[PDB]
Design an enzyme around this catalytic site. Structure first.
Site, PDB file in Angstrom:
ATOM      1  N   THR A  16     109.078   2.441  29.252  1.00 56.52           N
ATOM      2  CA  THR A  16     110.471   2.442  29.668  1.00 56.52           C
ATOM      3  C   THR A  16     110.668   1.778  31.023  1.00 56.52           C
ATOM      4  O   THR A  16     111.815   1.587  31.441  1.00 56.52           O
ATOM      5  CB  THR A  16     111.001   3.876  29.730  1.00 56.52           C
ATOM      6  N   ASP A  39     101.760 -21.697  13.083  1.00 54.86           N
ATOM      7  CA  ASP A  39     101.541 -22.344  14.369  1.00 54.86           C
ATOM      8  C   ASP A  39     100.494 -23.448  14.244  1.00 54.86           C
ATOM      9  O   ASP A  39     100.494 -24.197  13.262  1.00 54.86           O
ATOM     10  CB  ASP A  39     101.138 -21.277  15.391  1.00 54.86           C
ATOM     11  N   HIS A  69      97.271 -22.702  20.850  1.00 51.70           N
ATOM     12  CA  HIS A  69      98.530 -21.968  20.872  1.00 51.70           C
ATOM     13  C   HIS A  69      98.603 -20.962  19.729  1.00 51.70           C
ATOM     14  O   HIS A  69      99.020 -19.815  19.928  1.00 51.70           O
ATOM     15  CB  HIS A  69      99.696 -22.956  20.818  1.00 51.70           C
ATOM     16  N   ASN A 161     112.245 -22.664  24.829  1.00 48.43           N
ATOM     17  CA  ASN A 161     111.928 -22.706  26.251  1.00 48.43           C
ATOM     18  C   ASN A 161     112.725 -23.790  26.971  1.00 48.43           C
ATOM     19  O   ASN A 161     112.196 -24.523  27.807  1.00 48.43           O
ATOM     20  CB  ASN A 161     110.430 -22.914  26.454  1.00 48.43           C
ATOM     21  N   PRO A 175     120.571 -16.829  11.929  1.00 48.04           N
ATOM     22  CA  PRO A 175     120.941 -15.454  12.304  1.00 48.04           C
ATOM     23  C   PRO A 175     120.162 -14.374  11.569  1.00 48.04           C
ATOM     24  O   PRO A 175     120.000 -13.276  12.114  1.00 48.04           O
ATOM     25  CB  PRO A 175     122.438 -15.390  11.967  1.00 48.04           C
ATOM     26  N   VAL A 177     116.973 -14.194  10.797  1.00 46.63           N
ATOM     27  CA  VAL A 177     115.648 -13.941  11.350  1.00 46.63           C
ATOM     28  C   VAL A 177     115.810 -13.361  12.748  1.00 46.63           C
ATOM     29  O   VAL A 177     116.935 -13.201  13.235  1.00 46.63           O
ATOM     30  CB  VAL A 177     114.793 -15.220  11.365  1.00 46.63           C
ATOM     31  N   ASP A 200     118.155 -11.841  19.439  1.00 49.25           N
ATOM     32  CA  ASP A 200     118.166 -10.464  18.972  1.00 49.25           C
ATOM     33  C   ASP A 200     117.383  -9.516  19.861  1.00 49.25           C
ATOM     34  O   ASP A 200     117.680  -8.320  19.879  1.00 49.25           O
ATOM     35  CB  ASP A 200     117.592 -10.384  17.555  1.00 49.25           C
ATOM     36  N   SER A 224     107.746 -18.566  22.819  1.00 50.69           N
ATOM     37  CA  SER A 224     106.665 -18.656  21.852  1.00 50.69           C
ATOM     38  C   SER A 224     105.505 -17.709  22.148  1.00 50.69           C
ATOM     39  O   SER A 224     104.637 -17.547  21.288  1.00 50.69           O
ATOM     40  CB  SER A 224     106.198 -20.113  21.795  1.00 50.69           C
ATOM     41  N   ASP A 260     117.750  -3.385  30.943  1.00 53.63           N
ATOM     42  CA  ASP A 260     116.686  -3.366  31.936  1.00 53.63           C
ATOM     43  C   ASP A 260     116.291  -4.755  32.413  1.00 53.63           C
ATOM     44  O   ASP A 260     115.570  -4.867  33.410  1.00 53.63           O
ATOM     45  CB  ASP A 260     115.450  -2.648  31.379  1.00 53.63           C
TER      46      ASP A 260
END
Length: 279
Positions: A16, A39, A69, A161, A175, A177, A200, A224, A260
């Protein structure tokens, strides 16, 4: 379970509060739940994958991850030390060549592959897809991610990015996913992280230490990198029976840490991925 001195990202999804170093998680740890890492491939022989990772498909001369990656993102999903779901089957779909690039058609084929090849795998807890890739908007790439999601796989995708609004990037703008932004260890939106209404959830994305090719490790930054955190979290949550593939992104957003994160642009969700595990 408690993994001391874990990567800050792992400790953050189980916290938290920022600034802690222990990752807490149910010992089931994604047992029975598959995550496709779409990937550059996975160095399956990395001891951190301890036998649970394998390459299932490549669209290039080799399935060896010559980039790192994909090995890094697979490590964040389910490596023993750097992984969220430390017991999850990991499946490598090399849609990106060793430069990290890939035709959209190859990327689309890889997503359609996962939608079918999950029926060739044993994932009684459910299937997750980690898409730590992205390009400009493409309705065919979006719809391919929608198909993968609608087939019964969670699709977690990187917001991008570009420090831009992720509606202009695919499969981030799809939307259905789960579009993942990136945060840093100080609960700041990663300077590079894309934003916007299509996002999301946010995951740890800045200075994420995970596996690398050559049996090594290294820390890199990117949405990523936040995407395997959420993908591993979904596999973790699906193993616990907390949610399903069609509901995982909603569930993660419901159970996230709210308000947060700082420097979250107006209109973008202030949600940080949180396993909500109570030891």
């Amino acid at each position: 379970a408690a993994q001391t001195n874990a990567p800050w990202g792992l400790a953050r999804i189980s916290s938290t509060s920022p600034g802690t170093s222990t990752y807490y998680y149910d010992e089931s740890a994604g047992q029975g739940s598959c995550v496709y890492v779409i990937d550059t491939g996975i160095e399956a022989s990395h001891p951190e994958f301890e036998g649970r990772a394998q390459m299932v498909k490549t669209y290039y001369y080799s399935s060896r991850d010559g980039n790192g990656h994909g090995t890094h993102c697979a490590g964040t999903v389910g490596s023993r030390t750097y992984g969220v779901a430390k017991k999850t089957q990991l499946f490598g779909v090399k849609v990106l060549d060793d430069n990290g690039s890939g035709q959209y058609s190859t990327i689309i084929a890889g997503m359609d592959f996962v939608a079918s090849d999950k029926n060739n795998r044993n994932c009684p807890k459910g299937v997750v897809a980690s898409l730590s890739l992205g390009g400009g908007y493409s309705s065919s790439v979006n719809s391919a991610a929608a198909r993968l999601q609608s087939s019964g796989v969670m699709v977690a995708v990187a917001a991008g990015n570009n420090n831009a609004d992720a509606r202009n990037y695919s499969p981030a703008s799809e939307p259905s996913v789960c579009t993942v932004g990136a945060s840093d260890r100080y609960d700041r939106r990663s300077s590079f992280s894309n934003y916007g209404s299509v996002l999301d959830i946010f995951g740890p994305g800045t200075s994420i230490l995970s596996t690398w090719i050559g049996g090594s490790t290294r820390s890199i930054s990117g949405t990523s990198m936040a995407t395997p955190h959420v993908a591993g979290l979904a596999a973790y949550l699906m193993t616990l029976g907390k949610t399903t593939a069609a509901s995982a992104c909603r569930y993660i957003a419901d159970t996230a840490n709210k308000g947060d994160l700082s420097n979250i642009p107006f209109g973008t969700v202030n949600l940080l991925a949180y396993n909500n595990y109570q030891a």
